[PDB]
Amino acid sequence: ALTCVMEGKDIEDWSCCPTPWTSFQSSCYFISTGMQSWTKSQKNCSVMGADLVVINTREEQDFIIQNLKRNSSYFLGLSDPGGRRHWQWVDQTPYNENVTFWHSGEPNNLDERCAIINFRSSEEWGWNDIHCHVPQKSICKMKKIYI
Ligand SMILES: CO[C@H]1O[C@H](CO)[C@@H](O)[C@H](O)[C@@H]1O
Ligand SMILES: [Ca+2]
């Protein structure tokens, strides 16, 4: 089943997500609470027709964090596979340093080549580079369906 809501006041503009997903602007988001490596997480998002989350704006991040638990860490679709700080998003969209939300002092390791979002005291939610093989929860994102 799909969950559909109206965009603006236009009674014909209904956009939808599968029911276990949440919606914000033109995208659907799914929180995957199983612990898996970054690559297995991206594969899992791919199976449900999506990708690991790509964060475009502060507004988007502020929405996503409403659906996360402050004691948990979640993979983003953000990685540096060659260890050169040449960050990649999984949907081949640009990496814009001035719209990133790294915690203070992050990213801090060339050998930590995947990114997570989590909560740190006082700094609240932000990003950390970590080892890709360490199992974590993840966030998947895809476009809404219009009917
Ligand atoms: C707890 O946070 C610290 O350790 C992790 C790895 O566990 C690093 O990614 C992070 O930058 C800090 O140095
Ligand atoms: Ca780090």
Residue numbers in the entry: 67 to 213
Q: What do the authors report?
A:
Blood dendritic cell antigen 2 (BDCA-2; also designated CLEC4C or CD303) is uniquely expressed on plasmacytoid dendritic cells. Sequence analysis reveals that BDCA-2 also contains a C-type CRD, despite the fact that it falls into a structurally distinct group of type 2 transmembrane receptors. Stimulation of BDCA-2 with antibodies initiates anti-inflammatory pathways through association with Syk kinase and adapter proteins such as Btk and BLNK, leading to stimulation of phospholipase C and a reduction in secretion of type 1 interferon. Binding, structural, and mutational analysis of the receptor suggest that it has a primary binding site for mannose, but that selectivity for galactose-terminated glycans is achieved through a secondary binding site.
To investigate the nature of the primary sugar-binding site in BDCA-2, crystallization of the CRD was attempted in the presence of Ca2+ and α-methyl mannoside to allow binding of the monosaccharide ligand. There are two copies of the molecule in the asymmetric unit. The overall fold of the main portion of the CRD is similar to mincle and other C-type CRDs, with the N-terminal extension forming an additional pair of β strands linked by a disulfide bond. In copy A, sugar is bound in two alternate orientations, with roughly the same occupancies, related by a 180° rotation that interchanges the positions of the 3- and 4-OH groups. These hydroxyl groups interact with the Ca2+ and its amino acid ligands by the network of coordination and hydrogen bonds that are characteristic of C-type CRDs. Although the search model contained three Ca2+, a striking difference between the crystal structure of BDCA-2 and the structure of mincle is the absence of the two accessory Ca2+-binding sites, one near the conserved site and one on the other side of the CRD, in BDCA-2. Notably, several of the acidic amino acid side chains that interact with these two additional Ca2+ in mincle have been substituted by basic amino acids.
